[PDB]
Symmetry: D2
Subunit: 497 residues, 4 copies
Amino acid sequence: VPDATRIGRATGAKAPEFQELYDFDAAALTLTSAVFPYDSQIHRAHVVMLTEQGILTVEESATILSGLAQVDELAATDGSLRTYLPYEAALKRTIGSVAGKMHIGRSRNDLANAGKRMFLRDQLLRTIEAVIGYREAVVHKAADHLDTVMVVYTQRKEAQPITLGHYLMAISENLAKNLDRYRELYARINLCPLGAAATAGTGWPLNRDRTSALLGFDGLVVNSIEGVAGWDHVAEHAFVNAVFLSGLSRLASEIQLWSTDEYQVAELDASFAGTSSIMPQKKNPDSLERSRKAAFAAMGPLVGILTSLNAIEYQYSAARVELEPRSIDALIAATHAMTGVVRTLHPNKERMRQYAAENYSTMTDLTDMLVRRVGIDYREAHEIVAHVVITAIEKGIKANKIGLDLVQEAAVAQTGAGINVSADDIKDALDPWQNVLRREGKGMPAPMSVKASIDDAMAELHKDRAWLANATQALANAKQTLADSVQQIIQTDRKYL
Amino acid sequence: VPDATRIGRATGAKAPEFQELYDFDAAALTLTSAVFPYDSQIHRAHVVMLTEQGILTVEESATILSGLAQVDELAATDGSLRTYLPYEAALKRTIGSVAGKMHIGRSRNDLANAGKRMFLRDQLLRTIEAVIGYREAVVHKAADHLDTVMVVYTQRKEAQPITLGHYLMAISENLAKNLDRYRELYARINLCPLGAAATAGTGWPLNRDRTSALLGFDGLVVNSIEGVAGWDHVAEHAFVNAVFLSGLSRLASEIQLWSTDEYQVAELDASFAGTSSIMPQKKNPDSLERSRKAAFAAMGPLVGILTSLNAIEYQYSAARVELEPRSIDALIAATHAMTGVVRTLHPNKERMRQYAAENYSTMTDLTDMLVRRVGIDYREAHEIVAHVVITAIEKGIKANKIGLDLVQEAAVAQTGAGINVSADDIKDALDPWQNVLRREGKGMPAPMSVKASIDDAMAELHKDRAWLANATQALANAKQTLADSVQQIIQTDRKYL
Amino acid sequence: VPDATRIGRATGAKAPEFQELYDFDAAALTLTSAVFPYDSQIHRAHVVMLTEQGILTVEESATILSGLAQVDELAATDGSLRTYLPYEAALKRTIGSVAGKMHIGRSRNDLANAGKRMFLRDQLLRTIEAVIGYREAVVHKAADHLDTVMVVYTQRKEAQPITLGHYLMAISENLAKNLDRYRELYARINLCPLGAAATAGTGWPLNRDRTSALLGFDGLVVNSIEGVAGWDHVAEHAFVNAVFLSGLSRLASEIQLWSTDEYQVAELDASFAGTSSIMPQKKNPDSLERSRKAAFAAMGPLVGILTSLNAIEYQYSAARVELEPRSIDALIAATHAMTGVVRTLHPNKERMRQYAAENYSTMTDLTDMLVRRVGIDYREAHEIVAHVVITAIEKGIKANKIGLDLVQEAAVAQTGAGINVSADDIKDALDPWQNVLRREGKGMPAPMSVKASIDDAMAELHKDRAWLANATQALANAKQTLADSVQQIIQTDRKYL
Amino acid sequence: VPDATRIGRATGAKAPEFQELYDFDAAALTLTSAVFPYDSQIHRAHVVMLTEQGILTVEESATILSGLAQVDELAATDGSLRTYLPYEAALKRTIGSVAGKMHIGRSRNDLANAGKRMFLRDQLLRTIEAVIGYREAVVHKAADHLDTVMVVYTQRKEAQPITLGHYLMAISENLAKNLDRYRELYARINLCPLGAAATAGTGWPLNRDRTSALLGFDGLVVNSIEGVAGWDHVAEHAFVNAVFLSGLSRLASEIQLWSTDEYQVAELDASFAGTSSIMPQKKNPDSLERSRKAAFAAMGPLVGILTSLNAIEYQYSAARVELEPRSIDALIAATHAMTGVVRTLHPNKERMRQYAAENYSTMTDLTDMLVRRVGIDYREAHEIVAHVVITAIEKGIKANKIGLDLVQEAAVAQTGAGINVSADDIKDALDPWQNVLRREGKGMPAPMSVKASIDDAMAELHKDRAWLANATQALANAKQTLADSVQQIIQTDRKYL
Ligand code: NA
Ligand code: NA
Ligand code: NA
Ligand code: NA
């Protein structure tokens, strides 16, 4: 059975990234199920720490740890065992009374705060990886389009000539700052609240630093109230998601306008477009609109979380709203889809240049040339050239057909006086490629300037990747240390006690 | 005429910080009027830069700069001159045609982006100063209350014994992280978009680094589209405001519950309370509720800004929602008010201790003692001690009157068996001060632990202040350099040309 | 295996309504799966209409309709067949090419708009039924508590004496207006967009009124653009959910404060409370906090939907955010839970009355009595009685122990003059039950007044139920007509053609 | 001094409606100042009621009422007297102690709730009047464009041929439903909470019905808690504003796309457009983008209000967020601006028709014609005609140049078989005006159908106006009765007592 939506102009299959936008809702885990594996790791880390501290014997510890593996397997097909007291009860049914001792010095409150942090931590690295992939596609695309002349818009009106490369590096700069937001967040997420217990710590002699290290955290949430009451990192995670996706929505919208029947300066790759069940001419930007949809929806968790924090005291509270897996899954789907849209986008270079040459985006350079050549002030030059445009539109004269006579008449009609410039001066001013070449400062569209930005972006991308590799490795190392510690205890008890 | 609201139990005058909550709405500037002085500085910096670059002669530059001072004075009492084209026109009426030349290589788009950044930058430093003041009050208060025993709550139910000092250091830790959020934001706000012009830069040979330096920026918004399209810093500013204020709302709510007629464990200072026009017994938490009001309202700009970004393309757009002065003014009023509330709050130490001793928050330590002394698992100890509470509540026995007989009977009723602990063991477990002393790990309420946190917080506060002083000085130095540069040009032209 | 969370003070089982709060997230359908059955009904209604209009033969129609039943059964265990083109393709594989003809004069756009309306319509009736159940519990509770004297709060400070019955009728009045909001919404939801096709209707001679009637709609979305572009009803549904739940959050919060260890004027039934895994004394308001959680989360869809509408044109768009099943499911769970909380709530009548008698809520009546008896103006009486309170608090005198001497001394200390009232006058003023009896106007707490409100509410509840029964029956009748029509076509074709 | 922004292509003056968008922020009242006049009316109504009830003598009443006029004049230039206790104190300084008696049976709580309701009530009628004006412009415009053929869009892609008249009647249908939302709201806003006093009524024998009638209310907020705690009407007002404005944003966006340089199917009137300070070619949609800005910002109050309600108990609370004058002022400015945009919009009829004829929106009718003429199923016809489009785009053939040969070849290439239709059949199918004429059902673009909708809309507009006139007159009558009553008391006391 082929994909039934791939009919008419929707040729070939959906891109995998495009398909993700249709799968995440049904596939999403509940927060409870997403967090559960991390809770299991926390049980191991906590028990191991209690063993170092002499609160549990190695014998007790080995019995508990073997039990945890058994209950974990039970919970793999029984969701009802994925919350704490049901899990603890299953453990008790499995290994007996000693199961109760795993909760010494601990609460569901700091367990839950830690488990959710571990989940969000993982998802943050997942997100950073996706955003890096997005930025890579944007920067690589830009590098192929240093001389792809096109107009930039302001207020959805043609403004001045740029290049597609120049436009994409605006997106790269946006993404660089969002990557900073995410990395800044990570430092606050990756703190361990365990040892706070209910909210006030415990008389038991815990070593909070050990539990933290065994679970890959880079530090503690120190104060025990902050350990269970603290939730700002959840709000912040939802915020960075929302603001990052708003930038993604803006790009999606930009490309959607570019690929209208009327603009026609770009075309989506077929693998990122759909069609209509009734209108056979449609090549629809379903990838773009579903990506925007995700962006809009990301507003929801942000507001829900902040509302819930505004509504309570500085306490542990079961009333706090969560950042849920399905929300993060939508972000990843949209980010992947837009990565693919950007990679495979088909610019219509000839039409791009035609608009740049014909629809008056070159008028600023005409105005600048008057100021530079004849020394009149910018406001008067502007009024002259505005008159040129008004007359050209009235007479049906494209910008690249404007010559000396039209500019003279406009000058006279507008100021009573002619103006002392040549036909060659005007011709050069109205050449859209020369508009691009003139704009050669930092961050401007001239190829040498955009190329400088790309070189800088490539270096930053290397650091983005290095940061991600280091963060990921730190967690992998901790998880290996923990697994090794668990096996040491279980095997030594089995054979040598 | 005295303050007519200060009647009955509302004795004395409102604290100045309390009064701020009633004044900011009527006193708030429009964004246009708030940003205008920064636009004036930008005109000076831009003109000075054009002069270094040889785009303006020193003669032209001096004429413009003297004109700017004249129009600035006009605009001081004529709001209609506080937007760009009306201002430029007034300049032209003042010094003639050369006024038009100040706009060479520039747009309202990058002017506006820069001016708003300078406004928000200023407001951010204002905010950081206020938040530091808030944290100072919190930490200083905590230092006076290391042995002020009281219960902490979870889910608005008494949980365990802590101290007021311990509670306040949770707030300090919250504020430390919000100060990081704000400082992280500052680095993104303090980038100069000038030189982007409309959105694509300019053929004019600008030195973007000079303009940036003259206006106190620490770097550029490099890409010219990002220069005029970039708005995430506005969304981020609104977010940090919202999440910070949500923490302030939670403290306000906490104190409001503490100072209910039923809790009565704290009392607002009269200077932060009001009364009722009809009910003479009221001592109302108007300071707290108005502070929460500001927190709730801060949700509004955040949503409006993100909505507007989700709704457009990656372009300059006049449709973007702003962060307005009245919103920031509300934050400052609430932060100042809560600073004062915390400083002057009157704890009822005797009642705090009575609740800790009588209302069963000490039961966890009883449970821990059973586990520690007799080795039973935590879940069984918990069930025994829960039975103790159920029976004590049934019989009207306060926690500090629970003795050996009650614990034995509960143990037997619950498990069939007695339990082998002494009356002294039980007595020590149920002593709320000993509950506090037992909890002596990192971030826990024992005086030595909280004192460690305070020492750490005092060191961090010193760094908070150092950062603020350095940031402020950098702007003052730039503004002096600019003023000096303006006078050099004007005076040299006046006397020596 | 018993419910492992039911330990210690969490005695017995969770109430079923309480349990719902823990089940809805995992049990919730996707919008696609929730809407699918309605899409199947729409296929039948559309095909039947095409048959009346002579666009399909009875032979074609019977083949399609039998096919729909077959594909419906396939889709029951294959989610991939629950969107339109995959479903249509399965139909084509089942009955052949004629399957394609069911889409004549139709689009996914008006199909989707109609199907979602039918889903939301159903959910709205579900919601109205739940809200009626909530109001019934509130009104029935009030009727049992006409003389249950207690204080009402303003700004979380004790204000004046009322009754629990009086308080609950405030909630009833709130719910009456929310039921109006929902019924008003229903009239806009229950309009049929089918026949709009893509957005501009069709040349095919449809009878839009037939399709509408067969699907239980009470009218058309007339204009074809509005048919596919219209989405305000979705935003409105999300809004009424949010504002209704905000009232539910406020009640939950009220009861949570009432049931604090410090207030102790009410106690949750055990079946609506949980306990702590570590603190054995806890009787936690999990039902209340999870209900508030749902209220907060309802903010999310509202913002997401409105953002998406603000971001597009007045067109069909795949970017619009939806109101999803899990959101409505949360509302229903919270509404059911709070229905049960209210029904089973245990007031502490003795403590309620003690607070009313002792904590100065009776001071307004003392003030009123001075004005009435001696004719002084309200502001001066107020200042005298405020002084009475200040002195009584200083001296540790409860309100019901305030006598003539204290009032005289306060009067003198405050105005220089005594005041001419008797000890009996004062005693009557400070009697909290007499405070209640004096307040006998419309909407006031006197038993005869609250009883009048209850009688009115019972009559309104009868009309609420009548409206619901009528709306439900109308849909049942339409669905029966449709099923009958389908069988007529299939059987007549089978036997008689 | 002319408007300095009116340069270049920004010819003539701004339309007054356009200018409103630039004035409302600076001109907006504070809520306190907006509500104050209504509070003054409430003092009069309350005092008059107390006089009927014999609580005040006519002598006392006349002294107070004359005093109110005096303090009102003081407050006209002294904002500090616009809140209650300062006002009451000024009254006391003006007429002496008897001033205190105006507060008998009353609180700031029910005073404030009532005053805000009167303000919002007024603003609601203001809003309904503006929305009626908007709908009038839309419907009148549509009536002039019954044969103005143009394409409608879905997903920002050309869909099918309609008329501009047909499009505008979608907007009319939207506005009709928003007018229902507003009128439904009005019934809940126009209820009087006075007599609730603090929250529990009063022992004083008030006649709540008199006060209500004297202030133009159509009924009571009955329960006294609901009287001061009730706030849902504020949330609802903010919601209807937000959803109505989202529709306005969508129209603004639609017109903005229409008037892009690339679409060029409409042009804003110069009086609703601006230009650029740097780019002389710009004719900028400032009216549209500022209108959208208002729409986005309307999200803010809605979220702030609901957050505040979610955060408290069902009590009077000073923490509740308000709907403020500046927010409503923005709505009115945007509504007026868009009224003018619609009235003066310049369609480019020739280009509209050219797109309809050339860019393949007529393909659905080609597909329908195949089904109708040859009896093939819709899915196969669709695939054939999609192939026609693919080939036509490949070969550079506009839709109105597609003939029999191209359709045959597509049919063969796609199915192996030709198809039995004539050149005349194809020609008629591809004629965009005939596409419009074929679509002649309810709500479809055929002139006779749109004309029917206009006739219906004109009748509804008449009822909209009648409702508004009746509501307005009811308030004017009440205000006259009140003024007459005040003068009767003052003059009878002056001359006859
Ligand atoms: Na960076
Ligand atoms: Na820090
Ligand atoms: Na009603
Ligand atoms: Na209507």
